[PDB]
Each structure stands twice: as structure tokens, then as C-alpha cells.
Write a protein that binds this ligand. Structure first.
Ligand SMILES: C=CC[N+](C)(C)c1ccc(CCC(=O)CCc2ccc([N+](C)(C)CC=C)cc2)cc1
Ligand SMILES: C=CC[N+](C)(C)c1ccc(CCC(=O)CCc2ccc([N+](C)(C)CC=C)cc2)cc1
Ligand SMILES: *[C@@H]1O[C@H](CO)[C@@H](O)[C@H](O)[C@H]1NC(C)=O
Ligand SMILES: *[C@@H]1O[C@H](CO)[C@@H](O)[C@H](O)[C@H]1NC(C)=O
Ligand SMILES: *[C@@H]1O[C@H](CO)[C@@H](O)[C@H](O)[C@H]1NC(C)=O
Ligand SMILES: *[C@@H]1O[C@H](CO)[C@@H](O)[C@H](O)[C@H]1NC(C)=O
Ligand SMILES: *[C@H]1O[C@H](CO)[C@@H](O)[C@H](O)[C@H]1NC(C)=O
Ligand SMILES: *[C@H]1O[C@H](CO)[C@@H](O)[C@H](O)[C@H]1NC(C)=O
Lengths: 533, 533
């Protein structure tokens, strides 16, 4: 059809129409936005995609970037729904677009940036299927791809052959192409919102911060992730260490910075993936090997200064956090946590647990941390030690850093909306001790509760639409709230009162100062203590 | 009468009979136990009292030792009930005895050691009147006197003319005389219990610790005071500093340690009392100038070691703490507290408050302290900042140190009973924000609620007898509980469960781990933090 044929400045693109609920919308899958980072392009900045001729078959899904595959619970849906579902390849720099039907004139664009510790990811996962959101909200949804792991973050600072943040650029480039072409799919370029979760949420905030990205989007949404998370960046120095340490495992020639790169450039992708985790510098839960580097090019200065002087894009943002963030990481990395078990923790594994969580802390620091989360009226409670550990991981790595980002931001920002998601899906396949898990508000945002066959309750399908509207309304207004709607208002977050809201099946309530006592400890006390040592 | 004539190894003593409630008991007032520490005896160890001839008129009260007089609220009963009520004099080394009638055969003896920061005190105060306890419980009650302030604690370590702890000896000496003569008043020497409150409670524990005192008594009771309180001792060094600094204010000749003493020996007592507080080394609430010194003679080693190795008298003890300990000190020394006022505290006086309370703490330490007692969900609450400050003073100076003493003690002790007093007298004249004040369980122990004219409620008179029995039964059993009585039992404190009880007008409840979270901070964390700095 004509609906299915579009002309972009890059070339002509033929999509496909796909069913969605009762109607039918059109989708363009796997349009390339950069020259494939294969060969000796490996490790280098993305290169714009030389226009093609003839029509491109954007009817099928693209390959997924090389990465670590979670084989911890083979067959378990809970775990595999995040594993790549398409042939992996180094040629994976494509993007996907879900367009309403009929094609809009020019409407709100939403760009999804997936994330998984910067070592995994994938735009093709079924949980990230645009059709429900695109259709239910009349919106042009586009999800992009980017290089994860060593392929996108290995950083030998001085070299032009392997500077870091490279995978952060694949992002910008996709962001560039969208800006330059989304108008042909009926999307309004002056109104694109980029929203990502976890490492994606941190990436979103890193583009709000970075000069070269700043101009390419309108607003932002960060879900369980701010750019200043302890796990989201490293010095060009640490980056270099891990760069060579990787070479060292792969029997590379660590003599010349040029040779190191050559060697790493000749290894089968999966060989790099095999030793990927052997470079971490300490035993710890929630830290990844290849991550963004604070280089001075993508980031002018340390993130703290930028945050501090207002050196960032000032627009309006909507961000949030989930009830049980740390849950997922403990299960995968702490001793004592088991999937098929209640997982009560000994006061002896709780100690081991704590060490893994604050790996950069000395004794005194660890005590502080314990004195903090330990209940002493009953200090050997299996559950209390388990749940208390979940809070340590969560607060330290996701909540508290975001709260910091939120305060320093709203001091210059043009609007700040904050949610606290805490509804546990009726059909979650993970065990209860895990609660409202990390990354599990995603399925609600993308509207899966809307399909019968996934057995979601009725008030859950209600909440999904409630979320999906907040999210889309914000995206094209800079406010979640309906201009007049007879509903309760999602109040703006102020440094005065600082209200936020509960996202769940029952009637919204607004609260104040989310985890303030616990976060002053993380954001102020602990740091000052480890500093004096 | 004959009842009123007693023959002690020191000489003959003629007492007086005094009315008590419905009956009449006999009392021997102001019997000397040492040669008056006047002249150049000033500062020196006590000297045994050379036997006199003829009969001694123990019918009237003795003089009170020289000391600072609280003139803060002239006329206010609340404050003056503690001020000396008899002519002060350097000749004040006497003791008093309330004996039942008829004279017992040989019954339980109870020795009261008063206390007031080691700078004030007095055995003659009406709140320390033995008759009610002596009579209601059939017990020989004796209260002693001892040298306070510089007169009893000035310590120039090397010198024999002014070693410290001197006032601690006046105590031992009284304790000696009781042991050697109480049998003639019908008291059983093999069963004397020494009980004191505040500085008196700390003194009691210092005799449990000291070798030379150990043998002179049976059991002990400490009320709001352990011997290891931060305010109860100093190094021979600090003692010496304050010794000379005192001389310095009084224009003494700080040249020779012998001359310093001579000078101080020629000043009118009250002149020493005038500059007494100018020697403290820092602005702070709850610290006194002349206090026991850890010399190596009275105390073999640091109290911590002694506590640690079991180097102490192992008998059974009964100790306790009051609900609002810090209350009284803030009122008198912190900025923002007023007697005739509600006393809500600014987040700005609260900071000043905290500094005064932990005077030996650096920044980091102060933050720790604040991070600890501050409520951040509402961090500028007048009441919360006021009450939170009361807990800091209390925990740090009375509760937590006692809990430490209690744990290390019961690990070798032959019985440990712990109470938590929290009843606010119906007729207290102090303001409510003060709550269950420091030193206000005394009037209950000494049975004042038993006299009508003092307008105490009926359940209060009930509680006073309840206390007075616990106290006396313990004193001659080593257990508060009645051999069979159909009442709830005051459980023993174990390092396992560690139960204690509530003392108040309603039915006793037993609880566990008194202020454990707050005390681990004081007893373990804070110390380790200020240590690493
Ligand atoms: C769950 C949310 C879904 N989304 C948001 C996409 C998501 C978010 C975040 C992550 C990263 C998970 C981890 O890095 C911790 C778990 C982990 C720990 C250790 C290890 N090995 C040491 C390599 C093997 C040990 C078994 C592997 C994984 C993935 C997916
Ligand atoms: C109340 C309980 C009764 N008993 C147990 C007998 C008792 C217990 C404890 C004390 C000591 C009280 C103080 O040391 C703090 C109050 C204080 C602070 C500062 C000052 N100046 C600086 C010298 C003058 C300032 C105004 C004087 C007193 C007394 C009596
Ligand atoms: C947001 O920006 C607009 C336009 O610059 C301004 O009128 C408004 O007051 C700002 N509001 C906030 C949230 O600061
Ligand atoms: C109920 O929903 C689950 C979750 O998607 C689905 O896998 C299942 O097939 C449905 N019914 C069954 C067979 O339990
Ligand atoms: C107290 O001492 C007695 C006699 O030495 C002993 O029989 C008893 O077991 C001890 N009890 C405690 C409280 O340790
Ligand atoms: C009530 O008791 C108080 C407290 O001792 C006493 O001073 C007073 O005289 C009694 N009655 C009066 C006059 O208020
Ligand atoms: C081209 O795309 C794929 C080839 O893999 C396939 O669906 C079909 O042959 C073409 N698409 C359509 C529907 O024209
Ligand atoms: C001796 O003691 C005092 C003297 O101050 C006085 O009560 C009386 O004269 C004598 N005591 C008695 C009652 O014999």
C-alpha cells in the first residue's frame, strides 16, 4: 500500500501492517541508521548510513547486538523474556517504528532506549513491542539499537581507534536520523521524547547532560535509572585498566595501545564475551565491566559539576523507581538467595551480602551501612536480613542516586514529575520474596495487560492504560495530567515539598520526601565518612 | 532511754526518737567517722576518728560539705529541694542512722550514698529521710557524707598532699565504720547494701570495682549511674591540668607542685567554689571539674579492662535508669530551654545543643549523632528537636554507659536486676516537657508518697511501697521478689534475653534489650568512628 511506503532522506522504505487488538497499524522494522560496525569498525564511533537505492524491506526484525546471554534459569520465562530473541551479530545498528493508521499528519514521537547494565539489551524483545502503545495512544513509537559490552564501551582514552562511550553515540546517531526523518512517517520532530529504563534510563539522562545530544530531543523519561548511578560510569583511567586487562585474558599483546586494539579486533566476538566479566576489580553485586567513561568529550566535566552548575538541557522530565529494586541482583549474585526458595538470610550471609553491595567501602563504612539497615531488637531474623539487604542494594544503586539527580535537576529544570511504582503483577512468575521487581513496570508502560491471553487481571489492564496515558500525555505536553480531567492531579515535584505518587491498581495517593532518611545516609553521610576514611 | 543509748567502738552515742507515720522510731544523727578535713588536712585522705569520751549528742543534723549552690530558680521548690539545708563547713564528715524500734537483733543494713555531679550533695536533704524506709521496711538505714568538688577531688597525682579520689575514701571510711559498728545498732554487718543515685550510683560501682572497698559490703544498687560514665572519671593527667588551672585562676604560684597546694590550702573555701567551673576544657553540658581520677591506686587499671576481665566484686546488683534523663541538663545548660516555657527548639539551637552534648566529637562524629537522632521526614519540628535532644544527652551520659556496665558485669556477676522507671509524679513542680526527670525516682524509693501532706495520689503511694519493698527485699536476699508471693516476677537480666521492667503506677510488664539500637551507636559505632577520626 502507500501507507506502507515511505521516502526518507536515506532511501525508500517498505514496511508492513500488523494486527493490534481490534484494529491494524503499520510498522517499519530494522531500518539502518549507521554503517555496520563490523570489520575494523569494531570499537569505533558510528558512521552515518550511506543512502541506499531501491526500496528497503523493513518488514522483518533486525539482528541483535553481540552480548552475554543469561542461561541461569534455562527455559524459565521470567529470565528468558530478556534474552535476545533474534540472531546476534556485530551488524545490529537498526531501528524500528510503529506508526498509526492512517498515518498521522505530524504527531508526538517516543523513542525507546532499552538497557541492561550496558552489557545486554535488545530492541526486538516482545516486551518492547510498540504496537499497543502506538495504537492505543496515537503515537509514533521508535525503539533503537546500540552497541553493548566491550563492543560499545571498551575505552582506550587516547586512541581514536577505541575511545569509549561509542555505544552512547550509536544512540545519538539513531537520535539524529529520527530528527532528520521521522517527519516522513508523520511524526512531529519538535516533539520527541526519549524514555529508557535501567541502563537506558541512565543513557537518557546522559544525553540531557551531554552537549552534542542536548538539541536532538524535546523531553525525557527515566525509569529506574539516573546517569549518575555508581554503576553507570568510570574514569578514563579505570576504563583503560579494564581495556588492557581484557587484552590480558585474551592473550593479547599489551605492549602497544595500537596493537592491543588490533588483537582485540581479530578475536571472534563471543571470545570477548567469554572473558568479559573477568575484568571487574572487586567481588561485587551490581557493577558491569564496560560502561560509559567520563572522557571530557561526551562529558565536559564530572557529572557532579554539571549537575551542580546547571550545565545541562533544561526541559521537563518524568522519572520513577520501583518498590523492590535490589531484589533481582541479590538473587543472581548474593549467597543465600534462591529462586525456588523462601530465601531467609543468615546474619552471616547478610554480612557477605553487604560487602558485595558496597564494594568500595572500608570497615567503618560497612558498619555504618549495617548499623543502618540492621534491626537490633531482633537482629537475626531471616526475613529482616533478606528484605534489609534488598533495600541496601536498591537504595545504593538506583533510588538514592536518582533522588540526588532529581533534586539537583529540578533546581533549573522546567518541570519534574516523580512516580513510585509498587504493584506486583498478578501473574509474575518470579517468587514473592522478590516483590515489585526491577524492570517490571516495563510491561505496563508498553501495554501488555491489554492482551487477554497474557492472563492479567482487569484492574491491571486498567492501570496499564492509566500509565500509558500519563506517559504519552507527558510526551507531548510536558505534563502527564489531562488539561481538565476530573481525576486527581499528579503534582509537580518541588524542592520545597517534593511530592511524588504511587503507581498501582488502587486510587493514587501522593506522598513526600521518598526514602529521605535512608538517602541522606547514602548521598551525604556515607560519602563524607569514606572520604575522611 | 536505753533504746537511745548505744556503745560503739568509737565512743558512746545518744540518739533521738522521731515520729514516723503512726509509730515512733529512733535516729542517730551526725556521728563522725573521720577526723575533720579542715586546716591543712584539706585535700588529704580521711583520717580515722580518734575515739571520744563521754556521750556524743547524735540528736541534731550535721553540717554540709562546702559546695556550689544552685541559685538558678531562687525559691523554686523544684530546684532548692537539692540545695544544702544546713550550715556548710569543711568539717562535714559525719553519718546518720535510722534504727527501728524496738532495736532489731541484727537486720539488713542499707547505706545511702547521695550524689550530684561530684560537686554537690548532702545527706541531710529532706528527700533522703530514712525514717519512712527504716520504719516501713524494718531496716537499719544509714546515709553518709563525703567531700565534693575540689575539696574531695582535686588531683595532683604525684603528691601525697593532694592525690585524687580523696572523697571516694571518705566513703570507704564511712563504709569501714559501718562495718565495724553497725552491729551495735542491731544491724547485720554480713548484710549491708550500698545504693546511690547519679554520682552516688557511679561511686557505688567504683567500690564494686576497687580492691580496697570490695570486702566492706554485701550487695549494691545503682540508680541512674554506672562507674564508667563519660562524666565520672579522668586521667591523672587531665586531673593535674585542672588542678593547676584552678591555681591559675586563684593567682596561685604554679611553680612548684608543693606550693600550688599550699596556695590552694590558704584560700577561703568559697573562693575555690567561685572559680570551680572555669577549669572545664570545653563548652559542654554534663561534665564536672573535679571528679574521680583513674590513678592506679584506687583503680588498678582503666575501668574498661577491669570490666573486661572480671576484675571486680562479683555479687548481685540491682540498677536502673529513668525515662527522661537528659531533660534536666538541657534546661540548665542548652540554649533554647526555659522552665516557664514549652521549649520547642530551632533546628539551629538543636545544632548548638548537639555540640555541647558530645564535646569530644569532631564533625563527622556530630553528623553521625545527628543523622541518628534527626527525623528527616519532618526535620524542623520544634518538639522533635527538643525531645530528640533529651535522648542524646540521656543515652550518651546515663543509659548507654549503664547498659554497657550491665552487660560486661552480668557475665561474671551473681545476679542482675534491671528497672526502667517512667512514672511522672502527679505533683511534680517542673514543666511537662521535662517528663520523668533525672533523680525523681528518689522520692519514691525513700517513701515520701507515704505522707498525706505532700499531696501524692493513691496509686502513687501504692507504687512507693512497691518500690521500697523491692529495694529492701533485694538488699537482704539478693532478689527483689518475695519467696512465693502471688505477683509477677521481676525477671533476672541475662545476656541472652536481657529482660528488665517498667516501674510505674500500672501493672508491671517486662521488656527486652533496653535502647539497644541507640546504644550500639554510642557503645560501639561512634567510638570506632572518632577513633579512625
Ligand atoms: C530484570 C530486568 C530486565 N532488564 C531491565 C532488561 C535488565 C536489567 C538489568 C540487568 C543486569 C542484571 C545483572 O547484571 C545482575 C545479575 C547478574 C549477576 C552476575 C552475572 N554473572 C556473574 C555473569 C553470572 C552469574 C550467574 C550475571 C548477571 C539485566 C536485565
Ligand atoms: C536533679 C536531680 C537531683 N540530683 C540527683 C541530686 C542532682 C543530680 C545531678 C546534678 C548536676 C546537675 C548539673 O551539673 C547540670 C546543671 C548545671 C549546669 C551548669 C551550671 N553552671 C554553669 C555552673 C551555672 C549555670 C546556670 C550548673 C548546673 C545535680 C543534682
Ligand atoms: C517552564 O518554562 C516556561 C517557559 O520557559 C515558564 O513559563 C514556566 O514558568 C516554567 N515552569 C517551571 C516548571 O519552572
Ligand atoms: C495464563 O497466562 C500465562 C502467562 O502468560 C500463559 O503463559 C498461560 O498459557 C495462560 N494459561 C495457562 C496455560 O496457564
Ligand atoms: C549465684 O551464686 C550462687 C552461689 O555461688 C550460685 O549457686 C548461683 O548459681 C549463682 N547464680 C547466678 C545468678 O549466677
Ligand atoms: C499540696 O501539695 C504540695 C506539694 O508538697 C504542698 O506544697 C501544698 O501545700 C499542698 N496544698 C496546697 C497548699 O496547694
Ligand atoms: C522481504 O522481507 C522478508 C525477507 O526476509 C519477507 O517477509 C518477504 O520476502 C519480503 N517482505 C514483503 C512482505 O514484501
Ligand atoms: C544536745 O543536742 C542539741 C544541742 O545542739 C540539743 O537538741 C540538746 O541540747 C541536746 N540533745 C538532747 C535532746 O539531749
Amino acid at each position: 500500500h502507500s501507507e506502507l511506503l515511505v521516502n526518507t532522506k536515506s532511501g525508500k522504505v517498505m514496511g508492513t501492517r500488523v494486527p493490534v487488538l481490534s484494529s491494524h497499524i503499520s510498522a517499519f522494522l530494522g531500518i539502518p541508521f549507521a554503517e555496520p560496525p563490523v570489520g575494523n569498525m569494531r570499537f569505533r564511533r558510528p558512521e552515518p548510513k550511506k543512502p541506499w537505492s531501491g526500496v528497503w524491506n523493513a518488514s522483518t526484525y533486525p539482528n541483535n547486538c553481540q552480548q552475554y546471554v543469561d542461561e541461569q534459569f534455562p527455559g524459565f520465562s521470567g529470565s528468558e523474556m530478556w534474552n535476545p530473541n533474534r540472531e546476534m551479530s556485530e551488524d545490529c545498528l537498526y531501528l524500528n517504528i510503529w506508526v498509526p493508521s492512517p498515518r498521522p499528519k505530524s504527531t508526538t514521537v517516543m523513542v525507546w532506549i532499552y538497557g541492561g547494565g550496558f552489557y545486554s539489551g535488545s530492541s526486538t524483545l516482545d516486551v518492547y513491542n510498540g504496537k499497543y502503545l502506538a495504537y492505543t495512544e496515537e503515537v509514533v513509537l521508535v525503539s533503537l539499537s546500540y552497541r553493548v559490552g566491550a563492543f560499545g564501551f571498551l575505552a582506550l582514552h587516547g586512541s581514536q581507534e577505541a575511545p569509549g562511550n561509542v555505544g552512547l553515540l550509536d544512540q545519538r546517531m539513531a537520535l539524529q536520523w529520527v530528527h532528520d526523518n521521522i517527519q516522513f512517517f508523520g511524526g512531529d520532530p519538535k516533539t520527541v521524547t526519549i524514555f529508557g529504563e535501567s541502563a537506558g534510563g541512565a543513557s537518557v539522562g546522559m544525553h540531557i547532560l551531554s552537549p552534542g545530544s542536548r538539541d536532538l530531543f524535546r523531553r525525557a523519561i527515566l525509569q529506574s535509572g539516573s546517569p549518575n548511578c555508581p554503576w553507570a560510569s568510570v574514569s578514563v583511567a579505570e576504563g583503560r585498566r579494564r581495556a588492557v586487562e581484557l587484552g590480558r585474558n585474551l592473550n593479547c599483546n599489551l605492549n602497544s595501545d595500537e596493537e592491543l586494539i588490533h588483537c582485540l579486533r581479530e578475536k571472534k566476538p563471543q571470545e570477548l564475551i567469554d572473558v568479559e566479566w573477568n575484568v571487574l576489580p572487586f567481588d561485587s553485586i551490581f557493577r558491569f565491566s564496560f560502561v560509559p567513561v567520563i572522557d571530557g568529550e561526551f562529558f565536559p566535566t564530572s557529572l557532579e559539576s554539571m549537575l551542580n552548575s546547571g550545565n545541562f538541557k533544561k526541559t521537563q522530565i518524568l522519572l520513577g523507581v520501583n518498590k523492590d529494586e535490589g531484589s533481582f541482583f541479590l538473587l543472581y549474585g548474593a549467597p543465600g538467595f534462591s529462586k525456588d526458595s523462601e530465601s531467609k538470610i543468615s546474619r552471616e550471609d547478610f554480612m557477605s551480602g553487604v560487602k558485595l553491595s558496597v564494594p568500595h567501602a572500608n570497615d567503618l563504612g560497612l558498619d555504618a551501612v549495617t548499623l543502618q539497615y540492621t534491626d537490633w531488637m531482633d537482629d537475626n531474623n531471616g526475613i529482616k536480613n533478606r528484605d534489609g539487604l534488598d533495600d541496601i542494594v536498591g537504595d545504593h544503586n538506583v533510588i538514592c542516586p536518582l533522588m540526588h539527580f532529581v533534586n539537583k535537576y529540578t533546581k533549573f529544570g522546567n518541570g519534574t514529575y516523580l512516580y513510585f511504582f509498587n504493584h506486583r503483577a498478578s501473574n509474575l512468575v518470579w517468587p514473592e520474596w522478590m516483590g515489585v521487581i526491577h524492570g517490571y513496570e516495563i510491561e505496563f508502560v508498553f501495554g501488555l495487560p491489554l492482551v487477554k491471553e497474557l492472563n492479567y487481571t482487569a484492574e491491571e489492564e486498567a492501570l496499564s492504560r492509566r500509565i500509558m496515558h500519563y506517559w504519552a500525555t507527558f510526551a507531548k505536553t510536558g505534563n502527564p495530567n489531562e488539561p481538565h480531567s476530573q481525576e486527581s492531579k499528579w503534582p509537580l515535584f518541588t524542592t520545597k515539598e517534593q511530592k511524588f505518587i504511587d503507581l498501582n491498581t488502587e486510587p493514587m495517593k501522593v506522598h513526600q520526601r521518598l526514602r529521605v532518611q535512608m538517602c541522606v545516609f547514602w548521598n551525604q553521610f556515607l560519602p563524607k565518612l569514606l572520604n575522611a576514611t
